[PDB]
Design a protein around this ligand. Sequence first.
Ligand code: HEM
Ligand code: HEM
Ligand SMILES: CNCCN(C)c1cncc(CCc2cc(C)cc(N)n2)c1
Ligand SMILES: CNCCN(C)c1cncc(CCc2cc(C)cc(N)n2)c1
Ligand SMILES: C[C@H](O)[C@H](O)[C@H]1CNc2nc(N)[nH]c(=O)c2N1
Ligand SMILES: C[C@H](O)[C@H](O)[C@H]1CNc2nc(N)[nH]c(=O)c2N1
Ligand SMILES: [Cl-]
Ligand SMILES: [Cl-]
Ligand SMILES: [Zn+2]
Lengths: 416, 408
Amino acid sequence: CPRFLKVKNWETEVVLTDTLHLKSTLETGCTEYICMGSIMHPRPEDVATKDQLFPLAKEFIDQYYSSIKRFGSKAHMERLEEVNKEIDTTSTYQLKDTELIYGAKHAWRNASRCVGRIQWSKLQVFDARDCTTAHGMFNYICNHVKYATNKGNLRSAITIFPQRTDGKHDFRVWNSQLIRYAGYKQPDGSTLGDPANVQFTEICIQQGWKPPRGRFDVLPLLLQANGNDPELFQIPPELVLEVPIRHPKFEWFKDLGLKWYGLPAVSNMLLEIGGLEFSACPFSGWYMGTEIGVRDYCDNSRYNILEEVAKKMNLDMRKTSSLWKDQALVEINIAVLYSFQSDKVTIVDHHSATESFIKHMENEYRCRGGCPADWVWIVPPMSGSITPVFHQEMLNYRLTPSFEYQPDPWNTHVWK
Amino acid sequence: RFLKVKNWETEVVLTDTLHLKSTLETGCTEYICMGSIMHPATKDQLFPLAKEFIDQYYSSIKRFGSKAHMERLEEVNKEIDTTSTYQLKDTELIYGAKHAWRNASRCVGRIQWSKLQVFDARDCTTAHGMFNYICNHVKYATNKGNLRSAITIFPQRTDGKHDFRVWNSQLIRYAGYKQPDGSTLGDPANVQFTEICIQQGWKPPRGRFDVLPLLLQANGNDPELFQIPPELVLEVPIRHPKFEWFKDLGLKWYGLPAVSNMLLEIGGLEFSACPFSGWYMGTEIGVRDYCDNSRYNILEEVAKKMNLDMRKTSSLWKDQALVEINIAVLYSFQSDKVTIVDHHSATESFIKHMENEYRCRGGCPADWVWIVPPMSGSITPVFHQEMLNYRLTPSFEYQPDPWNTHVW
Ligand code: HEM
Ligand code: HEM
Ligand SMILES: CNCCN(C)c1cncc(CCc2cc(C)cc(N)n2)c1
Ligand SMILES: CNCCN(C)c1cncc(CCc2cc(C)cc(N)n2)c1
Ligand SMILES: C[C@H](O)[C@H](O)[C@H]1CNc2nc(N)[nH]c(=O)c2N1
Ligand SMILES: C[C@H](O)[C@H](O)[C@H]1CNc2nc(N)[nH]c(=O)c2N1
Ligand SMILES: [Cl-]
Ligand SMILES: [Cl-]
Ligand SMILES: [Zn+2]
């Protein structure tokens, strides 16, 4: 592979030079003959062997002591020797708190699909590696939610549960996000709530959950500690900050009865650091408007409200070339930003977030020699070309530490 | 491997086998994806390429290994032997042209691929001849508003020293003028080319929408200027169906979108002059030409007339202004009976086309970055459609701008 790769911004003519790609550790899925850049997702109870683990650990440890300007130091070599000893005797090792914090911040930093990474170094890391039970997990998660929510003044946070051992003792949050609304399939084929969540909702209901059967019912947490069967907990409602959607102009918009939750928090991903696998590592930030206004509300397979809004806007909905869909999409997204700003809950519009990302990316090319980015994910789902990211060439590659996808636990769990 | 692509909205899964046919590079490797990068012979090199292309043509007409097939392979060999090149049969030219379109991964309009009027211009020898051939192209494809897809193919490359090139990147473009005060009149994107035209004798009216002349190079010679007769150039004044003040913005655009800077490769042959044209998707004009910062850049003005709050970005004034501009463009072309497709219709058709291609052909190469429209992405079906990108031949490829390679 070539040492220097160049990306261009076609709006500004600015050209950046990437050398960081050379540190690429994993596979994109693409080859020279095919590109899989728009594929969403391109192993049994299986864990890293001693020989696989040594080099991955050294790689990470080197990188860490390089970052604190102590590469090749006595404390660097001693840490190498201590880790290598731990792998030899125990087939694994434990990260120091300093290294855990570095690794988490870097996994976010390396997350090519995140437009919010300007904030990567401000991340509160809760070390939950002493957790042993589902109730314990519940406690840690509640604390995360409250801290991150901060009464509306959101703060990004991640809570890391114990790493994987033999693969039969995994900690998992079964929820894909900490806060989601339930979906219920009706006998008639209609759906109530969020149609996307019918499967998970069914699982909950089976585990003992009593469903309110509403449009915006917060799901319980389904928590798995040390490989045991998962257990249900209801998040205390006072910890779940919500925002009712209203529009600065349309008085009738509040009559749609829409609202959304303040905190975006992903909990189905796997954090890999130095070859160690943290299968439960919920992390949370704050919303970009379009996540709600466009995808949650206007995806056909989600809440699908374009039609209903278009009707209350009295738009001609017979031709598509009237662009009634597009007009209603903008208004919805205006109401979302306005409802969040009015309740003083943190939210960033897609224009501000993308400009910030460009400034971030440029800084990263300057200080780091690169910034992996997934254009398909970074460009917002509305108004794409009037945001600066659309015109920015990006290179995508996988650096470690990283957040990775993992199988859904209900497909793999062995029931006790 | 066989590869699966999934649509996340319909949960439809298609199986791609066609990608196994490709050979040219994508730019990506196992470790680095360049999916968002815009730009990533000899007797011995020529024949296998020739061979393959002939092979797939006789395969496409259900006569693989026939007597016609054999003599053709023999013919091409003897001709590459003695002349260092070969000339395509008429039927091969048309097949190659339609398939270059069919294989164009960045094109959302490909459901139309087999309906393409092919103009064989391989007997052209001078710039005047090229102009005649291009005028006929424009007129046929314009067709008084009822646009029809067309391509005009000039002589193939020989030694790279006697190339045919249309120097305009598109057959119809507006000029761009660099003002003293540092502002830019017209289309800023073409400011350079415009100046090249002036430097060669073009007399600029210096307005906001002056149609550039054609600049045409035949057989490696210095290019020559020609003005397309105005009656061949169909233009549409843009107005809004509700905002009667919109016509006062004074905007117009041309009806014929016609790419002329690309290279058409068939059977190892290179057609460096092959202007091709179709009809517009509304966003091309409404979003890119008008609203790109480096283009006509009209958002702010329109936002003024719409009386929007422009102090903070979170009012989405930019987004609002954008939708109305695109409504106007669709409304104008439609009212003037000029062919145009909206991004909802064009994207639906493309998904349908993908289905067809997987069914009959075993795949459909597609560039998600280019196919998804530049506005309202996720309320179109292609946003949710996984796509595999790969390079099939015959194809349209990029080439150097001739003004960086030509000796006068
Ligand atoms: C602080 C404000 C943040 C903003 C504005 C932000 C923005 C976004 C957005 C808009 C997406 C696309 C989400 C989707 O379409 O589902 C995304 C994805 C992602 N973000 Fe960020 N994010 C933030 C915080 C964080 C934090 C704190 C982390 C990790 C420590 C993180 C890591 C990721 C990852 C791994 C993805 C990929 C998700 C997936 O593959 O499903 N983000 N981000
Ligand atoms: C008939 C209706 C057609 C429609 C609606 C259509 C639509 C589009 C659009 C919207 C683009 C993106 C253009 C841009 O953003 O610059 C595009 C690109 C492209 N089209 Fe089509 N097109 C049509 C016909 C054709 C024809 C007739 C050909 C060739 C025979 C063709 C070949 C291509 C190629 C090679 C590109 C890539 C352009 C580039 O790389 O700059 N298209 N098309
Ligand atoms: C379109 N993506 C599907 C995921 N999805 C429906 C979803 C549901 N609920 C919450 C999120 C949040 C995604 C996210 C995560 C983080 C850390 C920040 C942020 N702004 N968004 C996503
Ligand atoms: C993003 N576009 C850059 C090129 N550009 C400004 C441009 C100028 N003039 C015309 C076109 C047309 C592109 C095109 C080509 C074809 C065959 C069909 C179509 N609908 N659009 C593009
Ligand atoms: C097929 C395509 O990869 C898929 O629809 C992607 C497109 N880009 C996206 N971008 C973001 N931010 N989130 C998404 O879920 C998706 N979905
Ligand atoms: C950087 C990026 O590749 C570039 O802006 C692309 C994105 N997608 C596009 N899509 C279309 N149709 N046309 C374009 O010019 C572009 N530009
Ligand atoms: Cl932000
Ligand atoms: Cl079409
Ligand atoms: Zn790729």
